[PDB]
Subunit: 167 residues, 3 copies
């Protein structure tokens, strides 16, 4: 019934990588290229993409919803252009989660002006549990997570109607 | 192994996911490894996944 | 059937004006003939041992 957005990984903590160049025309905002606001598209800095080792411990008292993703490029040339490492990986781990994502390079038809793909993943981070991210490229690093502050009875209702100011 | 027995056989195996590349060489000495299992119906290839995980 | 190798076939539904791309440096079972869905309707896959009876 209610979320509470918290910053688990600040955008300014990515010193060794480029964090403010992950934009594209497919996600415009007031005429400028942008991206999803709750994740960060990290780009290689000075033609180098050092291996990332970041961890977050859920110091809160509630379940945490963490969203991250992987970027699948179009060809080998774009992979070197953005991350400089021909073969990359994203390894994510918690008490229960054990995940290693490998980017899939394939020629694809353009959708919304882009041929690449953004595959997003998630997990529920229980209190006192920690999530560990290791990646040397193609990492869509999280910035904001969701705190489950009130559970209850709800549903996802499919309807074209909108608010009617009634009870 | 060949199932010379007359009844169905339930066979169990597994794979180890280490903590880091140091433990991979510490225990097996080969950084890239695989496990391939094949039967008349099964065709499976397992690759270890290295990640930092909480202690259980 | 006298072979220890295996063929793993995959399929997708290609919508009009969409493009399917293939890149492979080996082990590729390339398509030659596709199928057009020229008519959709109420059908079923019936499991039976019988055959045609030339009736209605």
């Amino acid at each position: 019934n209610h979320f509470e957005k918290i910053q688990i990984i600040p955008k300014s903590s990515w010193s060794s990588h480029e964090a403010s160049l992950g934009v594209s025309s497919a996600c415009p905002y007031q005429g400028k290229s942008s991206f999803f606001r709750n994740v960060v598209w990290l780009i290689k800095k000075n033609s180098t993409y050092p291996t990332i080792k970041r961890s977050y411990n859920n110091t809160n008292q509630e379940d945490l919803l963490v969203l991250w993703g992987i970027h699948h490029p179009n060809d080998a040339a774009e992979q070197t252009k953005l991350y400089q490492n021909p073969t990359t990986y994203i390894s994510v781990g918690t008490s229960t989660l054990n995940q290693r994502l490998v980017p899939r390079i394939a020629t694809r038809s353009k959708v919304n002006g882009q041929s690449g793909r953004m595959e997003f993943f998630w997990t529920i981070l229980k209190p006192n549990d920690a999530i560990n991210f290791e990646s040397n490229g193609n990492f869509i690093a999280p910035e904001y997570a969701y705190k489950i502050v009130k559970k209850g009875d709800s549903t996802i209702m499919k309807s074209e109607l909108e608010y009617g100011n009634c009870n």
